[model samples]
Target chain A: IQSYPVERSRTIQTRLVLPPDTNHLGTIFGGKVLAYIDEIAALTAMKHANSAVVTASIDSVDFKSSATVGDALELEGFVTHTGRTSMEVYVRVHSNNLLTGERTLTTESFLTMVAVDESGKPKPVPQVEPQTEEEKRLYETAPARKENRKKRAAL
Target chain B: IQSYPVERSRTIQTRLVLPPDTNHLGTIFGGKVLAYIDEIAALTAMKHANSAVVTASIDSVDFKSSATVGDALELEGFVTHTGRTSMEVYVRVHSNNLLTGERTLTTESFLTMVAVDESGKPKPVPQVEPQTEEEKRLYETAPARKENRKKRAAL
Candidate 1:
């Protein structure tokens, strides 16, 4: 059974470019991409945790390319690994220009979500179980990831 | 000599407790914090790289606590490590109630930046040097951060 699984993946699919998203340099702001990453990752984490999960850390995000205004932004999320009380949700962001249909990897990130208790403290949650093919695949990837986290924490 | 030193450690500080930063739950929007994190980290990278460096990746950011719209938000960043063409900037975010003075660590992140040539392609940057005691300390921390990035990448 998978320890963590993707509960939802959303995309604007429509090109809705807002002017405020652009920086002074005429490029979409990195902050804008971070906004998209946070939104999608939040929903994904909440659904899987079945509880209000607090963002404890952002693992890493890199903007591989710039997304121009008037472009469609794609945000996708899947749970890659889980810990006693944390789940690492991976998000991949792409931008598709409506005019050219050119899709580019704009940003990629991993965010760790921690379940919170009524007292607003971190608490352990139920273990994840996989019931589907995709869920199983995601679960299998967790062991290595869990170990990676351990190694990094030691560093 | 310090291992990884950058030009400057610009500490970007701001208060974000207004109604402009809240979500439907009356809590500070994670996206707002994410935005602040990126801004501080980017500016730190630009200062260190001594050029308009673009964000190539962020390793991880974990949000530890939740705050309401009236909570003051702060972000601080500095260069932690560097490579031939890339540097890793670490950012810390804290939230405090202006009235209560209660502060907590809300989020933390590491970002990857790369100096770019005029063509916007990744280019080698001048080797960063440590000219201050604090800079030397940060440089010494670089070797230890390598494993963290490596494990985070695996995740």
Candidate 2:
């Protein structure tokens, strides 16, 4: 497959925030958001693979802002690239303060998932065929992003 | 002071379920609940130390039943025992079907946390003060539970 592409996005809708999720600081715990992010991204990868996948690693994450217990959390996910048997997902988190009606980007990260067969063995994922010109551009630019990954690795 | 006292209980209040948490199965992800369990246990350990701590490992966890997107997930943590720097937190995860008022214990596990200083170094946590008779009983019987710890270490 020359180009691989998939994307998913949602408003950190009401369901993303709940009363019991707040920590003593009156904001959602970082771990709580992390748990949701990891799980959702894994599931999204599984959706693209049509098979089970395990989290290999969270390549990077930046918590730019904070989300309070009642803040709306927007999430977006997509397969940015693929390797022999691994798929990379890009996830972003945003927040809308219910009280102030202000929205902002709160978190972003890259997660790698490995596709597994019925026997729990690593398997190659299907090629992502870009259906649009924009996806094709992103696909073509994926390799050039390698050096950016190296810079992140240095961090 | 001679024999440290501990307390154990599995009761915890229920929590709210949000929509963004649903997977393709529309069920609560296991890792999400595991994160919550870690938070509850970490809080318990901090209560014992009156300071901070870090998770050393999640010994084991079993996903029994599943929680739906809207089901309330309940988790409880108890300090089963303690060592020089590690505290054993026993956690139980439950799902309450709010519409039907049905409750079920879905998963349980033990996690060990070590108190840590600001430098991210392990530090000795204060011993449990089993002031009450029940606390004393649980503390006295804790040694036998070491067998469970041994198995977890083998994991």
Candidate 3:
């Protein structure tokens, strides 16, 4: 009972950009990307918690580049750290311009989700295990992110 | 030409939550809220810039509460601060549970949008003017938030 760690849930999803989610500038909407990020990340978190979950927070997001219509967006999410009742989920987005055959990194983000019971109270879950160097990198750095969260909230 | 500051643009949006955008918890997904936030903010930015705009960054978001199916979500966005080529946007979300006739504050977020020309390069825009106490408060406090953004990104 001292420690219980498992490779937590991870999810990958792909979508084709369309006029439905693009702006006047002919690129995908930032909010659309966020929806995809949250959906896949929620799937990952739900797999680990075996219960309903609600998002706590999503870290700052900067759209360094963008995906345009006809491009294919690739998104991935996984649990990088765990708390008594919350899990830190990391989400990344990339896109491939099908017409031009070009690939681009859309954005990377971290999200926090909390398991909730039937009545919506926070619930505890098993810890997360990182099996890859990338996962370990995020897991180790989770503390600093949380510290930054508090610092930003302080203002 | 030294200072051309109008009250600036603002946008308000409303939506009804459904299972399509809700998770297993039967409530609206976090990403759905985000998409709404960004879309409205983008509208406000576009109007102010008089040019196409793209989201540069969205500040951290936290979901304190959620709206369920049959609930009405209200969203608002406006320019609070400005940069040479980007504008700081403040967005707020609120929802009313129609079934129970209860109102709740969903979340508040800040987004940065950069005006872009035909080639998607950053373009300068007019400054923002605060007309109300809330607007002035957010405008004056924007520097601290930007500072926090850097502090978080350093990692």
Candidate 4:
């Protein structure tokens, strides 16, 4: 399989929180943020592999803060690691309070995506090389995370 | 803290897959399913704790199948475990074809929710007791899942 630098697969998306996506509590739904993460992660993976991909699993996501309607959500994602047919993408979610211009890290998630052929069977994908220190951290730690996933799956 | 039966926290929601929620692939976006899972899980957590709750973390979620626009999405959730101030809720997602009445499992997710007071400080929440075999299985498996989450967070 071929290989690509993490920078080549970097993706960013920005959107405004709207009423329909907000909960009765007047805050954006956590799932709404999750959706953004997934889409951006998928985009990053697709860019890395240049093939159709499906979400295999999402690692833990922590909501560090909250967002409300009228806030701007900025999501960034990039490939961290790649196996034969799977890629790990990290998504960083930030919420900007439009009124005050305050930005806060609201959530972060790791997603595993599997590239597939026309029949949806897993297909090999290129490897990913980190270009920055942060990407390096994600890349180096990928093996441990994969091991943890395997252990949990066994349990 | 007190305790609550799993049944007391059970939640179910159904919605039609709208066009806006679908992607260019003509299938529902994984994030849309995630949003539904998060909302349903939050509702279950709030009901069990009987207080305001916020999303803390979400366990791994795998998309087992795909759904297209106009499909009926059914989401069900309930409290599976609880700690001093946090509760784990399990969400099961299924998509039903309106014309054929065919239903297929789409995804499942576990969400950790923290109860909070008016000031957003963590508050004690009632423990959860399983009432069914499935709930019992989830209760027994919670510790391993929690351990996996802790390990991942440490990385």
Candidate 5:
């Protein structure tokens, strides 16, 4: 497999938290946020892998805050690490209150995706090389996160 | 807070994968499955808490299989453990092929939710008691998952 620059797979998506995305309580639904997270993660994976990718697992999503209807969702994601056939992605979700001009971190997550060929068999993906300080930090910390993943898999 | 049987909070939601739910590949998006999972988990948590509940964290979601448009999604969830103000709910998602009558487990997850009062402050919630063998297994295993969560939080 070839190596690819992390910047090549960086992605950002902005969406409005409209009525359709909100629950009866008028707050944006957690599932709606998760769907955006997965979408951005998938785009990043496919950009780096240059092939079809599928969600293998989602490590965790901590919802520290909530977003209301009419809010704006800013989702950013990029590749952090790669296995022989999998890419680990980190996604950050921020909610912006247009009326108050307040932006807050709402959700954070890590997702694993596997590259596949036309036949859907797992295939090799390009390695990611971190560039910035934050990217480097995520790259340096990936091993420990992966170790935890291994422990969870053993259970 | 009173103690409640797990059966009281058991929830099941069924939906059909529609054209809008699918990605360009015609497969259901991972986020759509996550949304259903969170919805059912929230319902289960509310049933036991007897108050408004908000998502705190999602432990994990392993996507073992894929679902296509026109497929049926069956989601089941129940409260497995409770803290002073939080409830841990386990959710399982299955995808059924309508034509062949084949069913496959698509996703599994554990979500943590906090009961909240009018002001959004965490409040006491009723505890849950496992009645069935599956519930008993999940109830007994919750501590380990919580331990892992604690470790991750400490990091």
Candidate 6:
């Protein structure tokens, strides 16, 4: 299969925490963040595969902090690994307070996306090549995460 | 503290998957499903705690299937476990095809919610009592899942 650089599929999306997306106390739900993450992951995977994709799994693992209304939630996603027909998208979520210019890491997630054809059957995807330190780190550690996923799912 | 039954905090919500919430192919994003899951988790936890709650984590280890536009996404949530201040809310998602009168299990999730005071400080929550076979099974498995969360987070 042909290979593509992680940069080729990097996708970033920023969303303002609206009142409707928050609780009465103004704390944004992880759902909203995960929604954003999934959108970006889909886009990133599609960019790499040049085909429609389906979500296989999502491992958010943690929520480091909370973001409130008016905060800008920025999510970045890119392909970190690829199997025969699946892609692992890594998304880093950051919460930015626009007024104060303060930013914090909200959470990190790995979403497994499968490239599919018009009939929704799994299709082969391009391999990912790392170019930067961050991308390489994620790329190298992906196999371990992949192994862990299989182990966890079996339990 | 008084204990509450798994039924007391049970919440059910149904939504129509619209064009806006689906991809070009009409496949709904897991993001939207997760967004629905979190809202019900928050509501269920609040019903039990009778106070504002915050999301601690979400464990949705699987995404069994996909739904499309015009499908009705129904989510049910209830408290399954409780600690000093945090409560575990289990959600079962079902997708219904209104025209066909068919429904299928979509996904399952567990969200950890902590009751919070005005200042967002954690507050004690009532215990969870299992009343059914399903509830009892989940209740028994929750401790192991909780422990697994800590172990996984530490890595």
The best candidate in terms of DockQ: 3
In the range A1-155, model 2's lDDT, one tens digit per residue, is 54334743211223357767654445565456667676677767877887766665553333456676777787766677777787766677788898999988776666666777865568988666655675567557766654454453453
Tell me the TM-score for chain B of model 4: 0.96
lDDT by residue (B59-93, candidate 4, tens digit) is 77877788878889999999999888989899999
User: Residue-wise lDDT of candidate 3 within B1-155, one digit each (tens)?
Assistant: 23334355888899989889786668788889998899898899988898888888898997768888889999988888887898888889999889788888899999989899988899988888787888889889988887876675675
Candidate 2 clashes between residue pairs 3 or more apart in a chain or in different chains: A12-A73, A12-A74
Candidate ranking (DockQ, best to worst):
3, 6, 5, 4, 1, 2
Show how many residue pairs clash in every candidate, following the order shown: 20, 2, 0, 0, 0, 0
TM-score for chain A in each prediction? 0.77, 0.77, 0.92, 0.97, 0.96, 0.96
Evaluate model 6: give its TM-score. 0.96
lDDT tens digits, residues B12-130, model 1?
A: 77776767565445567677788777788767877766566666666655556777776778888877667888877778888887778998888777777776765666777555666
What are the chain B TM-scores of all models? 0.79, 0.79, 0.92, 0.96, 0.97, 0.97
> Candidates' DockQ values?
0.48, 0.08, 0.72, 0.55, 0.63, 0.69
Model 6: residues with Cα > 4 Å off, grouped in runs:
none
TM-score, per-candidate, Cα-based: 0.77, 0.50, 0.92, 0.86, 0.92, 0.96
| Candidate maximizing TM-score | 6
What is the C-alpha lDDT profile of model 6 across A44-115, one tens digit per residue? 999999999988889844788989988899889999999999999999999999789899999988999998
Ranking by lDDT: 6, 5, 4, 3, 1, 2
* Superposition error at B11 for model 5 (Å): 0.8
**Model 1 - which docking category?**
acceptable
Candidate scoring better on DockQ of 5 and 6: 6
Worst 10 residues of 1 chain B by lDDT: B1-10
Lowest lDDT sum, 10 consecutive residues, model 4 chain B, at B21-30
Worst 10 residues of 5 chain A by lDDT: A21-30
Candidate 2 lDDT for residue B145: 61
Model 6 has a clash total of 0
Model 3 alpha-carbon drift over 4 Å, by segment: A1-8, B2-7, B150-155
